Design a protein around this ligand. Sequence first.
Ligand SMILES: O=C(NCc1ccc(OC(F)(F)F)c(F)c1)[C@H]1CN(c2nc3nc(C4CC4)ncc3s2)CCN1S(=O)(=O)c1ccc(C(F)(F)F)cc1
Length: 553
Amino acid sequence: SMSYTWTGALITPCAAEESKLPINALSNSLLRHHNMVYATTSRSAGLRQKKVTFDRLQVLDDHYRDVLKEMKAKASTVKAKLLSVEEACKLTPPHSAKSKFGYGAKDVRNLSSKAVNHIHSVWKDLLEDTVTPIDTTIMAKNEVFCVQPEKGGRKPARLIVFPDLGVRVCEKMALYDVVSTLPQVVMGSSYGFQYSPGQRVEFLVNTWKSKKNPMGFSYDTRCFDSTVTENDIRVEESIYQCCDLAPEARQAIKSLTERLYIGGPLTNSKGQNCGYRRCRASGVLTTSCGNTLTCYLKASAACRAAKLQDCTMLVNGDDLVVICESAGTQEDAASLRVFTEAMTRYSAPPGDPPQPEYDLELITSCSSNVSVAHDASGKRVYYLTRDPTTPLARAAWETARHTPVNSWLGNIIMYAPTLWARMILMTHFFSILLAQEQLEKALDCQIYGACYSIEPLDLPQIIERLHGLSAFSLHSYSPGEINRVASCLRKLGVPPLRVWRHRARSVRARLLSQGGRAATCGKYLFNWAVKTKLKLTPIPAASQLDLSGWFVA
Ligand SMILES: O=C(NCc1ccc(OC(F)(F)F)c(F)c1)[C@H]1CN(c2nc3nc(C4CC4)ncc3s2)CCN1S(=O)(=O)c1ccc(C(F)(F)F)cc1
């Protein structure tokens, strides 16, 4: 079936959409080439519609069936609980889109009677009706990028699809505990979301080291969400139903699958019918868990089809990276084409065709590659980095305009051991927070679908917990990583690393003068900036840390 059909009514904005970086004093000190930075608007939604609209052909085989049987057997060991309305209300993110039935997220979290009893009515309707498609809103997403003269051109807006707030709370009732617990049982060490960056780089490196003769590849599915078929979503459902579930959870999971997850009508911000979806919606509770299960099932079956030896999968939503034993040069190239043919029959055709790699640092996965530095002892330490272009473009944008979501903060947390997050992002934003006197103010950040409220003053213990103490002493980064950063700063008109070192010495001194947590920030986050280093010891609060958040679905 077609992933989408369209009526021709437009995907419309609801807020005023800005596309260009504005004139700013603080922003210009980050990057000068402001004209290289753009934000996607609804005006490019038509171009995205074309990319994501296509017929899916899907043919399944015994390898696919065998893998599924094994997954269902694991899933049969999981017991999940049905949350009450009130419990699911408390798990709703603070800034979630308001209901069209006259209450918003703040009312849901407060357990407002109008909100609670509406959700009860939505639940009752899911129990009685397993068929009628549930309405969804389609919106163009506004995201910031930098122009790439080498790439094809400017990226079109992504499209998001989400049901009403009351339906979103019912999803948590039925499925929050399942999406929380089932994937790690079914997929074990292949399940990507159980890992911090320290733990994911450790798993990738040790998986690579464990092979007699390693080969790996990333596999990039073209428009993964659109390749997910109604059958895939029902197969997903059949996995979930293997859990030990309350009878009302079983019924609501069936209804949510048939009425929402497999597809339904799309409504724009003006309330016009835009069309119909028969693939994955980006804004439902099961999208990360379902995409990870589906990608793992297809990949695992395809590994058996291609006869890859000892193939270790690492799956994070639609992100797939596979590390296996090489069968030799020619045999690996052939086997990866057969892997790709099997993924294609399963309706997961590649964007870029995959290629075997024999150096772990050459694989890109979760937009990131493994790189090497040295800790305070001189020991080799592996960590994940990425091209800093997009983080820096978005950082420039968030400096100039007020944004509800702070990509700079999520990038500091996920890329803390990197040369660029330490030298530029930490120095630049701590300088801003000091001058605004906002060091204590909690900020929202979103990381791969989970939302957190983070005070910048707690970054040292958060980084230690996610990365280890070495994240504050890394030095002697690789020439290729230094060159990539240096080159990106010249391209964007960002001051060179030597300028940041000087700005960081000043930020660091001013933090130390404040004592308390600010001084701990100056001591740990900026020990790299000073000639004579302080002795950095494990932070006490790094053990006792609430690293939990909310799903934004
Ligand atoms: O995405 C994550 N881990 C995977 C990952 C991805 C890219 C990586 O590489 C890169 F980018 F680092 F290079 C990398 F290494 C590691 C994030 C988010 N999480 C999530 N748990 C989920 N669980 C689900 C379940 C429903 C299916 N869905 C979605 C999410 S998102 C929990 C685990 N992490 S995390 O341990 O890194 C983290 C915990 C707490 C904070 C805090 F400090 F903010 F609190 C900040 C980060």
